[PDB]
Amino acid sequence: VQLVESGGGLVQPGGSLRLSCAASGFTFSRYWMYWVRQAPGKGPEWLSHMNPSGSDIKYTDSVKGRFTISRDNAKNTLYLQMNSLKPDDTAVYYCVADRRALGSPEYWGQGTQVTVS
Amino acid sequence: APSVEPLLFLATLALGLQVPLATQYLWDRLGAERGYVGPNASSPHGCGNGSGAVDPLREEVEALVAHWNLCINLGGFFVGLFSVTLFGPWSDSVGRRPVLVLPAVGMAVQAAVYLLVMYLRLHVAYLLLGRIISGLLGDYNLILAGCFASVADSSNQRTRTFRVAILEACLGVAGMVASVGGGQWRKAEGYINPFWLVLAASLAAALYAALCLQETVKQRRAAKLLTLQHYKAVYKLYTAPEDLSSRRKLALYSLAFFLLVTVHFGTKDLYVLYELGSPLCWASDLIGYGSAASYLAYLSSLGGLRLLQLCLEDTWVAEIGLISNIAGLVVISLATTTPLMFTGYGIMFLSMAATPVIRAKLSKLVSETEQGALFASVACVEGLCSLVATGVFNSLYPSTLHFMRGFPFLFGAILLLIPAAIMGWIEIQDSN
Ligand SMILES: Nc1nc(=O)c2c(CCc3ccc(C(=O)N[C@@H](CCC(=O)O)C(=O)O)cc3)c[nH]c2[nH]1
């Protein structure tokens, strides 16, 4: 199992960074998909999540109406576009993958660096 | 008409399918209420899962979920404590059937209340109301007491060990089906619809108990409820009667049973939560295999129990069962690799051959008309064991996690040095 992400980088404040989570090693049609970041010197800040279909999308009010999760199962990529980025956003964004159950493991991705400035 | 074994199967299927679903809903509601959109498990461990930094909000939601599970379990245990001790002694005086119909009805009502709470996304305090209502009618504990008494009323002295073993094998089979069916229905397109099976199972249990069960009390007198002689019927079971020094054996056996089932209950939880640790890191299927092999000891210890009885007495069989538990837990607590963990499951094949023996001997000591009282008290002890096991072991595991992972299993194995010594001392003392 491996999840690899590539959308980060040095983007200006207000840019439109678009992360991809090119997952494989498992089904990905039966897995919940999350997003999370570890801001500089701080802890995880879970952003969004989406049920195996694309119906149970939940956010956090810090990123409501500004982060737009998505997934495309025929390609096995999970997106999260970021409109109107802010300097408080810079972090290392990870891409988790859970079955939404207690006796199931979660598969943290490697996570890429977003350096908003 | 046939027998009582299907009742326990259907009633244990309810618990197995209910507890994970209930705590999953607790996670959902409590998390969403606090603006936390993340995984609904505890904090993970190892295998590149994050950075190690504490998740302050995830830990808060986890603590809240644990606190609410504690609250509902404790309330249920007190109402069950006050109810089963009144519904058991009466059962051995009016028949086992009514006292088996009532708790199945209570469990159906509880499942219906839980369903109504989930579909409406209601508060989580309302889950306490359902558990309290089911507790009044006698919880799952009263089902256990009624079934065990009903078996103990249809078997000789020289057969109660095997009959109780058969019943507990049905219990374990129901648990395995519940766990491995949850691992594929709860996980895949579940958490709401799989709870319909709980209501279906409880409705089936009530219907089978009422319209397809054959009572075992061959003479059912007429006795009033709310009598106070069903509470006095255990005080004058443990303290005054049985004067030929058969009063000490009751207390010692009860203590041994308490310790044994406490350890069993704690180690199951730590199994599921420890399989996916730092040096093991088990996949989703391997966890299902582990649960199946954990619950397959029920129906594989029965074969030995019946086979061992032909050569060793009914005590030493349980001594060997306790030795097998000790060996299995010791080799699991050192299982730093998956062949070692599966060997640890494998050694515990005579593992749950001891509990049947203990309760069977408890039954062989009381008179023929007091199995209701005896198994009411034993059911209360088992509920208290559930509570204490959960608390102690879930508090122990995080503490011995960066010091020596698996000390919960090691300490559980040190605990069973007491039941083995107790039972051996009793058996040695009878013969002299
Ligand atoms: N020997 C023996 N083996 C068993 O497997 C067993 C069982 C069913 C399995 C079981 C029962 C209670 C708990 C537990 O500790 N707590 C319950 C709470 C009950 C509730 O909330 O309704 C739980 O499953 O969480 C954990 C597991 C009932 N009685 C048993 N006796």
Coordinates of C-alpha atoms and ligand atoms in Angstrom, one line a residue:
Chain A
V1 CA 0.0 0.0 0.0
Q2 CA 1.2 3.5 -0.9
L3 CA -0.3 6.9 -1.4
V4 CA 1.7 9.6 -3.2
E5 CA 0.8 13.2 -3.4
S6 CA 2.0 16.0 -5.8
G7 CA 0.4 19.4 -5.8
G8 CA 2.4 21.4 -3.3
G9 CA 5.0 24.1 -3.8
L10 CA 5.6 27.9 -3.4
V11 CA 2.3 29.5 -4.4
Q12 CA 1.3 33.1 -3.8
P13 CA -1.4 34.1 -1.2
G14 CA -4.7 33.6 -3.1
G15 CA -3.4 30.9 -5.5
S16 CA -5.2 27.7 -6.4
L17 CA -3.1 24.8 -5.3
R18 CA -4.5 21.5 -6.5
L19 CA -3.4 18.4 -4.6
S20 CA -3.7 14.9 -6.1
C21 CA -3.4 11.6 -4.1
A22 CA -2.4 9.0 -6.6
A23 CA -3.4 5.9 -4.5
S24 CA -2.9 2.2 -5.3
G25 CA -2.1 -1.1 -3.6
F26 CA -5.8 -1.5 -2.6
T27 CA -9.3 -1.1 -3.9
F28 CA -9.9 2.6 -3.3
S29 CA -13.5 2.1 -4.2
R30 CA -14.4 0.9 -0.7
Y31 CA -12.2 3.4 1.3
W32 CA -13.0 6.7 2.9
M33 CA -10.6 9.4 2.0
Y34 CA -9.5 12.2 4.3
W35 CA -7.1 15.2 4.3
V36 CA -5.0 16.6 7.1
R37 CA -2.1 19.0 7.6
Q38 CA 0.6 19.5 10.3
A39 CA 1.2 23.3 10.3
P40 CA 4.7 24.5 11.2
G41 CA 5.3 23.4 14.8
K42 CA 1.8 22.2 15.5
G43 CA -0.5 19.2 15.3
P44 CA -2.9 17.6 12.8
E45 CA -5.7 19.7 11.5
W46 CA -8.1 17.3 9.8
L47 CA -9.6 19.1 6.8
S48 CA -12.2 17.1 4.9
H49 CA -13.4 13.6 4.3
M50 CA -15.5 11.7 1.7
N51 CA -17.4 8.4 1.8
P52 CA -16.6 5.7 -0.8
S53 CA -19.3 7.1 -3.1
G54 CA -19.0 10.9 -2.9
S55 CA -22.1 11.7 -0.9
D56 CA -20.9 12.2 2.7
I57 CA -18.6 15.1 2.3
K58 CA -17.8 17.0 5.5
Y59 CA -15.4 19.9 6.1
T60 CA -14.1 22.0 9.0
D61 CA -15.3 25.5 9.4
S62 CA -11.8 26.9 9.0
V63 CA -11.8 25.6 5.4
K64 CA -15.5 25.6 4.6
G65 CA -16.3 27.1 1.2
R66 CA -12.6 27.2 0.3
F67 CA -11.5 23.6 0.1
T68 CA -13.3 21.3 -2.3
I69 CA -12.5 17.6 -2.0
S70 CA -13.2 15.2 -4.9
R71 CA -12.3 11.7 -6.1
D72 CA -12.2 9.8 -9.4
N73 CA -12.3 6.1 -8.8
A74 CA -11.7 5.0 -12.4
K75 CA -8.3 6.7 -12.1
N76 CA -7.8 6.3 -8.3
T77 CA -6.9 9.9 -7.4
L78 CA -8.2 12.0 -4.6
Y79 CA -8.2 15.8 -5.1
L80 CA -8.5 18.8 -2.8
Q81 CA -8.4 22.1 -4.6
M82 CA -7.5 25.2 -2.5
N83 CA -8.9 28.5 -3.7
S84 CA -7.9 31.7 -2.0
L85 CA -4.9 30.4 -0.1
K86 CA -3.6 32.3 3.0
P87 CA -0.2 32.4 4.8
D88 CA -1.8 30.6 7.7
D89 CA -2.3 27.6 5.4
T90 CA 1.3 26.5 4.8
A91 CA 1.7 22.9 6.1
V92 CA 2.5 19.4 5.1
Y93 CA -0.8 18.0 3.7
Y94 CA -1.3 14.2 4.2
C95 CA -3.9 12.0 2.5
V96 CA -5.4 9.3 4.8
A97 CA -7.5 6.3 3.7
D98 CA -9.7 4.6 6.2
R99 CA -12.6 2.1 6.1
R100 CA -14.6 4.1 8.7
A101 CA -14.5 1.2 11.2
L102 CA -12.8 0.4 14.4
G103 CA -11.0 -2.8 13.5
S104 CA -9.6 -1.3 10.3
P105 CA -6.2 0.4 9.7
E106 CA -5.7 3.8 8.3
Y107 CA -3.1 4.4 5.6
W108 CA -1.4 7.8 6.0
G109 CA 0.2 9.1 2.8
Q110 CA 3.6 10.5 2.5
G111 CA 2.3 14.1 2.3
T112 CA 3.6 17.0 0.3
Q113 CA 4.8 20.5 1.4
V114 CA 2.7 23.5 0.6
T115 CA 4.6 26.7 1.2
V116 CA 2.0 29.5 0.7
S117 CA 3.8 32.8 0.3
Chain B
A1 CA -39.9 -27.4 21.4
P2 CA -36.3 -28.5 20.7
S3 CA -34.0 -26.7 23.2
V4 CA -32.4 -23.5 24.5
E5 CA -29.1 -23.4 22.6
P6 CA -30.4 -21.3 19.7
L7 CA -31.6 -18.6 22.1
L8 CA -28.0 -17.9 23.3
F9 CA -26.8 -17.9 19.7
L10 CA -29.4 -15.3 18.7
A11 CA -28.9 -13.2 21.8
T12 CA -25.1 -13.1 21.6
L13 CA -25.4 -12.2 17.9
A14 CA -27.2 -9.1 19.2
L15 CA -24.3 -8.1 21.4
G16 CA -21.7 -8.8 18.8
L17 CA -23.5 -6.8 16.2
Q18 CA -24.5 -4.1 18.7
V19 CA -21.5 -3.0 20.6
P20 CA -19.3 -1.9 17.7
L21 CA -22.2 -0.3 15.9
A22 CA -23.2 1.6 19.1
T23 CA -19.7 2.9 19.7
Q24 CA -19.3 3.8 16.0
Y25 CA -22.5 6.0 16.2
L26 CA -21.1 7.5 19.4
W27 CA -17.9 8.4 17.4
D28 CA -20.0 9.9 14.6
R29 CA -22.3 12.0 16.7
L30 CA -19.7 13.2 19.3
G31 CA -17.1 14.0 16.6
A32 CA -19.5 15.9 14.3
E33 CA -20.9 17.8 17.3
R34 CA -17.3 19.2 18.0
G35 CA -16.4 20.0 14.4
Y36 CA -14.0 17.1 14.0
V37 CA -14.0 15.4 10.6
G38 CA -11.4 12.6 10.8
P39 CA -11.1 8.9 11.3
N40 CA -13.5 7.3 13.8
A41 CA -10.9 5.1 15.5
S42 CA -8.5 5.8 18.3
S43 CA -5.1 7.3 17.7
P44 CA -3.0 5.0 15.5
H45 CA 0.4 3.7 16.1
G46 CA 3.5 3.3 13.8
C47 CA 4.0 2.4 10.2
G48 CA 4.4 5.9 8.9
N49 CA 1.1 7.0 10.3
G50 CA 1.7 10.7 10.7
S51 CA 4.5 12.2 12.8
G52 CA 3.7 11.2 16.4
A53 CA 2.4 14.6 17.4
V54 CA -0.7 14.4 19.5
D55 CA -4.0 15.1 17.9
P56 CA -5.6 17.3 20.5
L57 CA -9.1 17.2 19.0
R58 CA -9.0 13.5 18.0
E59 CA -7.9 12.7 21.6
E60 CA -10.7 14.8 23.0
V61 CA -13.3 13.1 20.9
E62 CA -11.8 9.7 21.8
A63 CA -12.0 10.5 25.5
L64 CA -15.5 11.7 25.2
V65 CA -16.6 8.6 23.4
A66 CA -14.9 6.4 26.1
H67 CA -16.6 8.5 28.8
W68 CA -20.0 8.0 27.2
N69 CA -19.5 4.3 26.7
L70 CA -18.6 4.2 30.4
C71 CA -21.7 6.0 31.3
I72 CA -24.1 3.8 29.4
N73 CA -22.4 0.6 30.4
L74 CA -22.4 1.6 34.1
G75 CA -26.0 2.6 34.1
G76 CA -26.9 -0.6 32.3
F77 CA -24.9 -2.6 34.8
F78 CA -26.7 -1.1 37.8
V79 CA -30.1 -1.6 36.4
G80 CA -29.2 -5.1 35.4
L81 CA -27.7 -5.8 38.9
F82 CA -31.0 -4.8 40.5
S83 CA -33.1 -6.6 38.0
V84 CA -31.5 -10.0 37.3
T85 CA -31.2 -10.8 41.0
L86 CA -35.0 -10.4 41.2
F87 CA -35.8 -12.2 37.9
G88 CA -33.6 -15.2 38.4
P89 CA -34.7 -16.6 41.7
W90 CA -38.2 -16.1 40.6
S91 CA -37.5 -18.0 37.3
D92 CA -36.6 -21.1 39.2
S93 CA -40.0 -20.9 40.8
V94 CA -42.3 -20.1 37.8
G95 CA -40.4 -21.6 34.8
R96 CA -37.4 -20.6 32.7
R97 CA -39.5 -19.6 29.7
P98 CA -41.0 -16.3 31.0
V99 CA -37.7 -15.2 32.2
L100 CA -36.2 -15.9 28.8
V101 CA -39.1 -14.2 26.9
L102 CA -38.8 -11.0 28.9
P103 CA -35.1 -10.1 28.2
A104 CA -35.4 -10.9 24.5
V105 CA -38.3 -8.5 24.4
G106 CA -36.2 -6.0 26.3
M107 CA -33.4 -6.4 23.8
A108 CA -35.7 -6.0 20.9
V109 CA -37.0 -2.8 22.4
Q110 CA -33.4 -1.6 23.0
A111 CA -32.5 -2.3 19.4
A112 CA -35.6 -0.4 18.2
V113 CA -34.7 2.6 20.4
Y114 CA -31.1 2.5 19.1
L115 CA -32.4 2.4 15.5
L116 CA -34.7 5.3 16.1
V117 CA -31.8 7.3 17.5
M118 CA -29.5 6.6 14.6
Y119 CA -32.0 7.3 11.8
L120 CA -32.9 10.6 13.5
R121 CA -29.4 11.6 14.4
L122 CA -30.7 12.3 17.9
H123 CA -28.6 13.1 21.0
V124 CA -26.3 10.5 22.5
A125 CA -27.8 10.8 26.0
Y126 CA -30.9 9.1 24.6
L127 CA -28.9 5.9 24.1
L128 CA -28.9 5.7 27.8
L129 CA -32.6 5.6 27.9
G130 CA -32.7 2.5 25.7
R131 CA -30.1 0.7 27.7
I132 CA -31.9 1.6 30.9
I133 CA -35.2 0.3 29.5
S134 CA -33.6 -2.9 28.4
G135 CA -31.9 -3.2 31.8
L136 CA -35.2 -3.1 33.7
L137 CA -36.5 -6.2 31.8
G138 CA -33.2 -7.9 32.5
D139 CA -30.3 -7.3 30.2
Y140 CA -28.3 -9.8 28.1
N141 CA -27.1 -11.1 31.5
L142 CA -30.6 -12.4 32.3
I143 CA -30.7 -14.3 29.1
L144 CA -27.4 -15.9 30.1
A145 CA -28.6 -16.8 33.5
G146 CA -31.9 -18.2 32.2
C147 CA -30.2 -20.3 29.6
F148 CA -27.6 -21.7 32.0
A149 CA -30.2 -22.5 34.6
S150 CA -32.4 -24.2 32.0
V151 CA -29.5 -26.4 31.0
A152 CA -28.6 -27.1 34.6
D153 CA -32.2 -28.3 35.2
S154 CA -31.9 -30.9 32.4
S155 CA -28.7 -32.8 33.1
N156 CA -27.3 -35.1 35.8
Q157 CA -24.3 -34.4 38.0
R158 CA -22.2 -36.4 35.5
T159 CA -23.3 -34.4 32.5
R160 CA -23.5 -30.7 33.5
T161 CA -19.9 -30.1 32.5
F162 CA -20.5 -31.2 28.9
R163 CA -23.9 -29.6 28.7
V164 CA -22.6 -26.2 29.9
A165 CA -19.7 -26.6 27.4
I166 CA -22.1 -27.2 24.6
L167 CA -24.0 -24.0 25.5
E168 CA -20.9 -21.9 25.8
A169 CA -19.7 -23.3 22.4
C170 CA -22.9 -22.0 20.9
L171 CA -22.1 -18.7 22.6
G172 CA -18.7 -18.6 21.0
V173 CA -20.0 -19.6 17.6
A174 CA -22.5 -16.7 17.8
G175 CA -19.7 -14.4 18.7
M176 CA -17.5 -15.5 15.9
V177 CA -20.3 -15.1 13.3
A178 CA -21.1 -11.7 14.7
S179 CA -17.5 -10.5 14.6
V180 CA -16.6 -11.8 11.2
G181 CA -19.9 -10.8 9.7
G182 CA -19.4 -7.3 11.2
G183 CA -15.9 -7.2 9.7
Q184 CA -17.6 -7.3 6.3
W185 CA -21.0 -5.7 6.8
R186 CA -20.2 -2.9 9.3
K187 CA -17.1 -2.1 7.2
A188 CA -18.6 -2.3 3.8
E189 CA -21.8 -0.3 3.3
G190 CA -22.7 -0.5 7.0
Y191 CA -23.1 1.2 10.4
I192 CA -26.9 1.7 10.0
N193 CA -28.3 -1.2 8.0
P194 CA -26.3 -3.9 9.9
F195 CA -28.2 -2.7 13.0
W196 CA -31.4 -4.1 11.4
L197 CA -29.9 -7.5 12.0
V198 CA -29.8 -6.8 15.7
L199 CA -33.5 -6.0 15.8
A200 CA -34.1 -9.1 13.6
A201 CA -32.0 -11.3 15.8
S202 CA -33.8 -10.1 19.0
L203 CA -37.2 -10.4 17.4
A204 CA -36.3 -14.0 16.3
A205 CA -35.0 -14.7 19.8
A206 CA -38.2 -13.6 21.5
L207 CA -40.4 -15.5 19.0
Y208 CA -38.4 -18.7 19.4
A209 CA -38.4 -18.4 23.2
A210 CA -42.2 -17.8 23.3
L211 CA -43.5 -20.0 20.6
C212 CA -40.8 -22.6 20.1
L213 CA -39.1 -23.2 23.4
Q214 CA -39.9 -26.1 25.8
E215 CA -39.7 -25.3 29.5
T216 CA -37.4 -27.2 31.8
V217 CA -38.8 -26.7 35.2
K218 CA -40.8 -29.9 35.6
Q219 CA -42.9 -28.3 38.4
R220 CA -43.5 -24.6 38.3
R221 CA -45.1 -23.3 41.5
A222 CA -46.9 -20.0 41.9
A223 CA -44.8 -17.2 43.2
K224 CA -45.3 -13.4 43.3
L225 CA -42.8 -10.9 42.0
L226 CA -41.7 -7.9 44.0
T227 CA -41.5 -10.3 46.9
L228 CA -38.2 -9.5 48.6
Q229 CA -37.6 -13.3 48.8
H230 CA -35.7 -13.2 45.5
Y231 CA -33.1 -10.9 47.1
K232 CA -33.0 -12.9 50.3
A233 CA -32.7 -16.0 48.1
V234 CA -29.0 -15.3 47.3
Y235 CA -28.1 -14.1 50.8
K236 CA -29.6 -17.4 52.1
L237 CA -27.6 -19.0 49.3
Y238 CA -24.2 -17.7 50.1
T239 CA -24.1 -17.0 53.8
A240 CA -26.2 -19.3 56.0
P241 CA -27.0 -22.5 54.1
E242 CA -25.0 -25.5 52.9
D243 CA -23.5 -25.9 56.3
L244 CA -21.2 -28.9 55.5
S245 CA -18.4 -26.4 54.7
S246 CA -19.7 -26.2 51.1
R247 CA -20.0 -22.4 51.7
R248 CA -16.3 -21.6 51.2
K249 CA -16.1 -23.5 47.9
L250 CA -18.9 -21.3 46.6
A251 CA -17.0 -18.1 47.4
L252 CA -13.6 -19.4 46.1
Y253 CA -15.1 -20.6 42.8
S254 CA -16.9 -17.3 42.4
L255 CA -13.7 -15.5 42.8
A256 CA -11.9 -17.7 40.4
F257 CA -14.6 -17.3 37.8
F258 CA -14.5 -13.5 38.3
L259 CA -10.8 -13.4 37.6
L260 CA -11.0 -15.7 34.7
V261 CA -13.7 -13.9 32.8
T262 CA -12.2 -10.6 33.6
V263 CA -9.0 -11.6 31.9
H264 CA -10.9 -13.1 28.9
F265 CA -12.9 -9.9 28.4
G266 CA -9.9 -7.6 28.7
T267 CA -7.7 -9.6 26.4
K268 CA -10.2 -9.8 23.6
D269 CA -10.3 -6.0 23.4
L270 CA -6.6 -5.7 23.6
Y271 CA -6.3 -8.3 20.9
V272 CA -8.3 -6.3 18.4
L273 CA -6.6 -3.0 19.4
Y274 CA -3.0 -4.5 19.6
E275 CA -2.9 -6.6 16.4
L276 CA -2.5 -3.4 14.4
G277 CA 0.4 -2.0 16.4
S278 CA 3.9 -0.8 15.7
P279 CA 5.9 -4.0 15.0
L280 CA 2.9 -6.1 13.7
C281 CA 1.0 -3.6 11.5
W282 CA -1.7 -6.1 10.4
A283 CA -3.8 -5.6 7.3
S284 CA -7.6 -5.7 7.3
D285 CA -7.9 -9.4 6.4
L286 CA -5.3 -10.6 8.9
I287 CA -7.4 -8.9 11.6
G288 CA -10.4 -10.9 10.5
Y289 CA -8.3 -14.1 10.6
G290 CA -7.2 -13.1 14.1
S291 CA -10.7 -12.6 15.3
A292 CA -11.9 -15.8 13.8
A293 CA -9.0 -17.7 15.4
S294 CA -9.7 -16.0 18.7
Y295 CA -13.4 -17.1 18.6
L296 CA -12.6 -20.5 17.2
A297 CA -11.1 -21.5 20.6
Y298 CA -14.6 -21.8 21.9
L299 CA -15.6 -24.6 19.6
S300 CA -12.2 -26.2 19.7
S301 CA -11.9 -26.3 23.4
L302 CA -15.2 -28.1 23.6
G303 CA -13.8 -31.1 21.6
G304 CA -10.9 -31.4 24.0
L305 CA -13.2 -30.9 27.1
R306 CA -15.3 -33.8 26.0
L307 CA -12.1 -35.7 25.1
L308 CA -10.1 -34.9 28.2
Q309 CA -12.9 -35.9 30.6
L310 CA -12.4 -39.6 29.7
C311 CA -9.0 -39.6 31.5
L312 CA -8.8 -36.6 33.9
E313 CA -11.4 -35.4 36.4
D314 CA -13.5 -32.3 35.8
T315 CA -11.1 -30.1 37.7
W316 CA -7.7 -30.9 36.1
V317 CA -9.3 -30.4 32.7
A318 CA -9.8 -26.8 33.7
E319 CA -6.3 -26.7 35.1
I320 CA -4.9 -27.6 31.7
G321 CA -7.3 -25.1 30.2
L322 CA -5.8 -22.4 32.4
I323 CA -2.3 -23.5 31.6
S324 CA -3.2 -23.2 27.9
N325 CA -4.5 -19.7 28.5
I326 CA -1.3 -18.8 30.3
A327 CA 0.9 -20.2 27.6
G328 CA -1.1 -18.4 24.9
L329 CA -1.0 -15.1 26.6
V330 CA 2.7 -15.3 27.4
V331 CA 3.5 -16.2 23.8
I332 CA 1.2 -13.4 22.5
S333 CA 2.7 -10.7 24.7
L334 CA 6.1 -11.6 23.2
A335 CA 4.7 -11.9 19.7
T336 CA 6.8 -9.3 17.9
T337 CA 6.0 -10.9 14.5
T338 CA 3.0 -12.4 12.8
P339 CA 4.0 -16.0 12.9
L340 CA 4.4 -15.6 16.7
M341 CA 1.0 -13.9 17.0
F342 CA -0.7 -16.7 15.1
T343 CA 1.1 -19.3 17.2
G344 CA -0.1 -17.4 20.2
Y345 CA -3.7 -17.8 19.0
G346 CA -3.1 -21.4 18.2
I347 CA -1.8 -22.4 21.7
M348 CA -5.0 -21.1 23.2
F349 CA -7.1 -23.9 21.8
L350 CA -8.0 -25.4 25.1
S351 CA -8.3 -21.8 26.3
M352 CA -12.0 -21.4 27.1
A353 CA -12.4 -25.0 28.4
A354 CA -12.0 -23.7 32.0
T355 CA -15.0 -21.3 32.4
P356 CA -17.6 -24.1 31.5
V357 CA -16.0 -26.3 34.2
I358 CA -16.2 -23.5 36.9
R359 CA -19.9 -22.6 36.4
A360 CA -20.8 -26.4 36.1
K361 CA -19.1 -27.1 39.5
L362 CA -20.9 -24.0 40.9
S363 CA -24.2 -25.6 39.7
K364 CA -23.3 -29.0 41.2
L365 CA -23.0 -27.4 44.6
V366 CA -26.4 -25.6 45.0
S367 CA -29.6 -27.6 45.4
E368 CA -31.7 -28.5 42.4
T369 CA -34.1 -25.7 43.0
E370 CA -31.6 -22.9 43.2
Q371 CA -29.9 -22.8 39.9
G372 CA -31.9 -19.6 39.1
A373 CA -30.4 -17.8 42.1
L374 CA -26.9 -19.2 41.5
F375 CA -26.8 -18.1 37.8
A376 CA -28.4 -14.8 38.6
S377 CA -25.5 -14.1 41.0
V378 CA -23.0 -15.4 38.4
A379 CA -24.5 -13.2 35.7
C380 CA -24.1 -10.2 38.0
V381 CA -20.5 -11.2 38.6
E382 CA -19.9 -11.5 34.8
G383 CA -21.3 -8.0 34.2
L384 CA -19.0 -6.6 36.8
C385 CA -16.1 -8.5 35.2
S386 CA -17.0 -6.9 31.9
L387 CA -16.9 -3.4 33.4
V388 CA -13.6 -3.9 35.4
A389 CA -11.9 -5.7 32.5
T390 CA -12.6 -2.9 30.1
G391 CA -11.5 -0.2 32.6
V392 CA -8.3 -1.9 33.8
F393 CA -7.1 -3.2 30.5
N394 CA -7.9 -0.1 28.4
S395 CA -6.2 2.0 31.0
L396 CA -3.2 -0.4 31.2
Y397 CA -2.4 -0.7 27.5
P398 CA -1.5 3.0 26.7
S399 CA 0.7 3.2 29.8
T400 CA 2.8 0.1 28.9
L401 CA 3.2 1.1 25.3
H402 CA 6.6 2.8 25.0
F403 CA 8.0 0.7 27.9
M404 CA 7.1 -2.9 27.1
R405 CA 4.3 -3.4 24.6
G406 CA 2.3 -6.4 25.5
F407 CA 2.5 -6.1 29.3
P408 CA -1.3 -6.1 29.3
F409 CA -1.2 -9.7 28.1
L410 CA 1.7 -10.5 30.4
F411 CA -0.2 -9.2 33.4
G412 CA -3.3 -11.0 32.3
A413 CA -1.3 -14.2 32.3
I414 CA 0.0 -13.4 35.8
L415 CA -3.6 -13.0 36.9
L416 CA -4.5 -16.5 35.9
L417 CA -2.0 -17.9 38.3
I418 CA -4.6 -17.2 40.9
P419 CA -7.6 -19.1 39.4
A420 CA -5.4 -22.1 38.7
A421 CA -4.1 -22.1 42.3
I422 CA -7.5 -21.7 43.7
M423 CA -9.1 -24.5 41.7
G424 CA -6.1 -26.8 42.4
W425 CA -6.2 -26.1 46.1
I426 CA -9.9 -26.9 46.2
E427 CA -9.6 -30.1 44.3
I428 CA -6.6 -31.3 46.3
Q429 CA -8.4 -30.5 49.5
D430 CA -11.5 -32.5 48.7
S431 CA -9.5 -35.7 48.1
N432 CA -7.9 -35.5 51.5
Ligands
LIG1 N1 -17.3 -16.7 28.8 C1 -18.1 -15.7 28.1 N2 -17.6 -15.4 26.9 C2 -18.2 -14.5 26.1 O1 -17.8 -14.3 25.0 C3 -19.4 -13.9 26.5 C4 -20.2 -13.0 25.9 C5 -20.3 -12.2 24.6 C6 -19.0 -11.5 24.3 C7 -18.8 -10.2 25.2 C8 -19.7 -9.9 26.1 C9 -19.5 -8.8 26.9 C10 -18.4 -8.0 26.7 C11 -18.1 -6.8 27.6 O2 -17.2 -6.8 28.3 N3 -19.0 -5.6 27.6 C12 -20.2 -5.5 26.7 C13 -21.2 -4.5 27.1 C14 -22.6 -5.0 27.1 C15 -23.6 -4.0 26.5 O3 -23.2 -2.8 26.4 O4 -24.7 -4.4 26.1 C16 -19.6 -5.2 25.3 O5 -19.6 -6.0 24.4 O6 -19.1 -4.0 25.2 C17 -17.5 -8.3 25.8 C18 -17.7 -9.5 25.0 C19 -21.2 -12.7 26.8 N4 -21.0 -13.4 27.9 C20 -19.9 -14.2 27.7 N5 -19.2 -15.1 28.5

